[PDB]
A paper describes a structure:
GlcB generates malate and coenzyme A (CoA) from glyoxylate and acetyl coenzyme A (AcCoA) following the conversion of isocitrate to succinate and glyoxylate by ICL. Because of the essentiality of the glyoxylate shunt in infection and the absence of it in humans, both ICL and GlcB are attractive targets for drug discovery. The active site is an ∼20 Å-long tunnel located at the interface of the TIM barrel and a loop comprising residues 616–633 of domain II. A Mg2+ ion required for activity is bound at the bottom of the active site tunnel in an octahedral coordination by one oxygen each from the carboxylate side chains of Glu-434 and Asp-462, two water molecules, and two oxygens of glyoxylate.
Finally, we obtained crystals of ligand-free GlcB to prove that the open lid protein conformation discovered through fragment is indeed corresponding to the apo form of the enzyme. The best quality malate synthase crystals are packed in the P43212 space group and always have density for bound glyoxylate, which tends to co-purify with the enzyme. We diluted the enzyme to 0.1 mg/ml in assay buffer containing 5 mm Mg2+ and incubated it with substrates to remove residual glyoxylate. After 1 h, we concentrated the enzyme back to 5 mg/ml, extensively washing it with an excess of the same buffer. This sample yielded a P43212 space group crystal that diffracted to 2.2 Å, showing well defined density for the CoA binding loop in the “in” conformation and an open active site lid. Interestingly, there is no electron density for Mg2+; the peak at the corresponding position is of the similar intensity to surrounding waters (2 σ in the 2Fo − Fc map). Collection of multiple crystals were required to achieve this uniform conformation of the moving loop structure with the data still of lesser quality than the glyoxylate-bound P43212 crystals used for fragment soaking. The apo structure has the “in” conformation for the CoA binding loop and the open active site lid conformation originally discovered through the fragment-bound structures, with a disordered Mg2+ ion. Combining our observations from all the crystal structures and published kinetic studies thus far, we propose that glyoxylate binds first to the apo enzyme (active site lid open and CoA binding loop “in”).
Author numbering: 3 to 71, 76 to 150, 153 to 197, 199 to 301, 311 to 379, 384 to 675, 679 to 726
């Protein structure tokens, strides 16, 4: 079933894929590459294993501590004693180089898409440019007599048009009058726009940055604001442009400035066939020839306010997100049976692939010659140090100069949060971002303090002292480490796919909090969230936050215990009902269809775009309420059974779970996640999930 190379037994599909598709073009000797792999896996595996065991020893110690008991003073002293809370390093500045300006300079939206889905991955890459009009018309941003019918509704149209003209006014203002009264654009020398009883220019001429067509009647005017590009498309002959008083047919926003192709929480990849699919798609993006023709967009040409032709990138600068340290995968199995660590595997294979995106021989990702890898679920700075070591070993096997493989550190584990400055310092010449999330981090929060008592409800976690301090701490640390002109400070994902008006209203808080990037669920959402980077001068904000220490180690460690009495019976029911629905709705699709991400209607029927992290939080909360006797096993079974046919309801378009639950592999998976969730390492969900997806796939054979 396998190819023996050194002490490794590689799955043939994987072996064949690396040799036939990946290796050619990289100037890496196939046999050499394979011994390289063999070497790295043997060398780094016990360290990898050492790190994983340290996690369990720490959690055990913490579990016992709580069981013998809150004295927040000795608690913090205990953590220090065991090596969980480490000493905070001296002040420093990251020194990472050869990084693209999308990362170092531009604040903008950031897309995340499951790599296994070439259609989504294609749109993601093409989402760097996005029509504002389409985004406004199609979503609930413009309210509905402007209803969306089977045909275009001109009423909705000039509402769209009005909104856009106002956007231009706030973003690239004219010295006199508004864009709403524009009648035409000309390029005298510079960008002059004709008003009815006037003619005016850009209040700051530097905002003009190019155009197309002829200077007298340009086909489009390129504008720039806060490093982001705005393009007004001008075609009086077009249907839209015929009714526009300056012949404007559309406004195009530079939107998803970067994208993350995800091998982690948004996919289901449980054996060697899945991984190859992922790697193959990642290959196609890097060579630049993936298609379905819908091709990757080529770059864009323009004319400076009196000069030559310059080209702007037309694709989203791509990061890849490898899996984390925990999992093994039988794509590579050792001589004596043991599955190799998935993360080590990802570093070599996605790193090898990325080499193709460094040159044309057609499409290039990084222009400065870096490979950008996001690493998730690290706990503490020894774990960061190992990842950097993994990368340096890989860059040797690949022939790449050291420091080629950049790191984006996800801050989503408690032991990383309280040692963030040191985690950053361990990657000080590789790091190109940090980022915060609600979902994994809360999962970890619940699991680390599982034994201390029952946690507050899920909806309530969003406002807890620990999480507010954690968000602020992330930014402070990034800024103090000198991120402003160097790396991204990122914030989490907007998960309500349909609530775009709501998104435009609230998600502005993230750049206001000094985040240079944040996550959006789609190309449409990317365009809309780009509006926020125009309103908010992030570099200004980041400059204002300098030297500020707005979160103390005492605040970070405030465990979210519910106060006594707390809830009335029906509130508890709603909570478990809601959690069981989230688990089922997601798990049914993960196990039966290997679809890691899609729109799962929640209890109140909102379309949520959640990944595996939602599993982690929902399950850990229930296991917590189980452990402290808030609810019983008799309670949990009940809801899980009640919600099961309703998930079945929300899935018309599949194999029902009700009424014969005990023979549904998904229903068993979801149930296991609850009842044994307290036993899962850091409440991770992969172990139970990977097992069951494999189980189900052995029903399909």
């Amino acid at each position: 079933d396998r190819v023996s190379v050194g002490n490794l037994r590689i799955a043939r599909v994987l072996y064949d894929f690396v040799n036939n598709e990946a290796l050619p073009g990289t100037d890496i000797d196939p046999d050499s590459f394979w011994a390289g792999v063999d070497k790295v896996v043997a060398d780094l595996t016990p360290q990898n294993q050492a790190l994983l065991n340290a996690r369990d020893e720490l959690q055990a110690q913490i579990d016992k501590w709580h069981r013998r008991r809150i004295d927040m003073d000795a608690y913090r002293q205990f953590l220090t004693e065991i090596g969980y809370l480490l000493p905070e390093p001296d002040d420093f500045t990251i020194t990472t180089s050869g990084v693209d300006a999308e990362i170092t300079t531009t604040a903008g939206p950031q897309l995340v898409v499951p790599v296994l889905n070439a259609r989504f991955a294609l749109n993601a890459a093409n989402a760097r440019w996005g029509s504002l009009y389409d985004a406004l018309y199609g979503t609930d941003v413009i309210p509905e007599g402007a209803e969306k019918g089977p045909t275009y509704n001109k009423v909705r149209g000039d509402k769209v048009i009005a909104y856009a003209r106002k956007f231009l006014d706030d973003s690239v203002p004219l010295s006199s009058g508004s864009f709403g009264d524009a009648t035409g654009f000309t390029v005298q020398d510079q960008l002059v726009v004709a008003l009815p009883d006037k003619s005016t220019g850009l209040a700051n001429p530097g905002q003009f940055a190019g155009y197309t067509g002829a200077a007298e009647s340009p086909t489009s005017v390129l504008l720039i604001n806060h490093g982001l590009h705005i393009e007004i498309l001008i075609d009086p002959e077009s249907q839209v442009g015929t009714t526009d008083r300056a012949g404007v047919k559309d406004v195009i926003l530079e939107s998803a400035i970067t994208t993350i192709m995800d091998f982690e929480d948004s996919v289901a990849a449980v054996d060697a066939a899945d991984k190859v699919l992922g790697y193959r798609n990642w290959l196609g993006l890097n060579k630049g020839d993936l298609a379905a023709l819908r091709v990757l967009n080529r770059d864009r040409n323009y004319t400076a306010p009196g000069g030559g032709q310059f080209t702007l990138p037309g694709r989203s600068l791509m990061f890849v997100r490898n899996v984390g340290h925990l999992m093994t995968n039988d794509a590579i199995v050792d001589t004596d049976g043991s599955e190799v660590f998935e993360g080590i595997m990802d570093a070599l294979f996605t790193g090898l692939i990325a080499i193709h995106g460094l040159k044309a021989s057609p499409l290039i990702n990084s222009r400065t010659g870096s490979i950008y890898i996001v690493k998730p679920k690290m706990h503490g700075p020894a774990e960061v140090a190992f990842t950097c070591e993994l990368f340096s070993r890989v860059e040797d096997v690949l022939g790449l100069p050291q420091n080629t493989m950049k790191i984006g550190i996800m801050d989503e584990e408690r032991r990383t949060t309280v040692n963030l400055k040191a985690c950053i310092k361990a990657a000080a010449d590789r790091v190109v971002f940090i980022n915060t999330g609600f979902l994994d981090r809360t999962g970890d929060e619940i699991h680390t303090s599982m034994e201390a008592g029952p946690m507050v409800r899920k909806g309530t976690m969003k406002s807890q002292p620990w999480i507010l301090a954690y968000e602020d701490h992330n930014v402070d640390a990034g800024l103090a480490a000198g991120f402003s002109g160097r790396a991204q400070v990122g914030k989490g994902m907007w998960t309500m796919t349909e609530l775009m008006a709501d998104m435009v209203e609230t998600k502005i808080a993230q750049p206001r909090a000094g985040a240079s990037t944040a996550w959006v669920p789609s190309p449409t959402a990317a365009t809309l969230h780009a509006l926020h980077y125009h309103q908010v001068d992030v570099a200004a904000v980041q400059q204002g936050l300098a030297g500020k220490r707005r979160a103390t180690i005492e605040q970070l460690l405030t465990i979210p215990l519910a106060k006594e009495l707390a809830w009335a019976p029906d509130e508890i029911r709603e909570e478990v009902d809601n959690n069981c629905q989230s688990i089922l709705g997601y798990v049914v699709r993960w196990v039966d269809q290997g679809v890691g991400c899609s729109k799962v209607p929640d209890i109140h029927d909102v379309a949520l775009m959640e990944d595996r992290a939602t599993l982690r939080i929902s399950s850990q909360l229930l296991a917590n309420w189980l452990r402290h006797g808030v609810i019983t096993s008799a309670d949990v079974r009940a809801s899980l059974e009640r919600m099961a046919p309703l998930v079945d309801r929300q899935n018309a378009g599949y194999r029902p779970m009700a009424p014969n639950f005990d023979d549904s592999i998904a229903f068993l998976a979801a149930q296991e996640l609850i009842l044994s969730g307290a036993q899962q390492p850091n409440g991770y969900t992969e172990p139970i999930l990977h097992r069951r997806r494999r189980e189900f796939k052995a029903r399909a054979a």
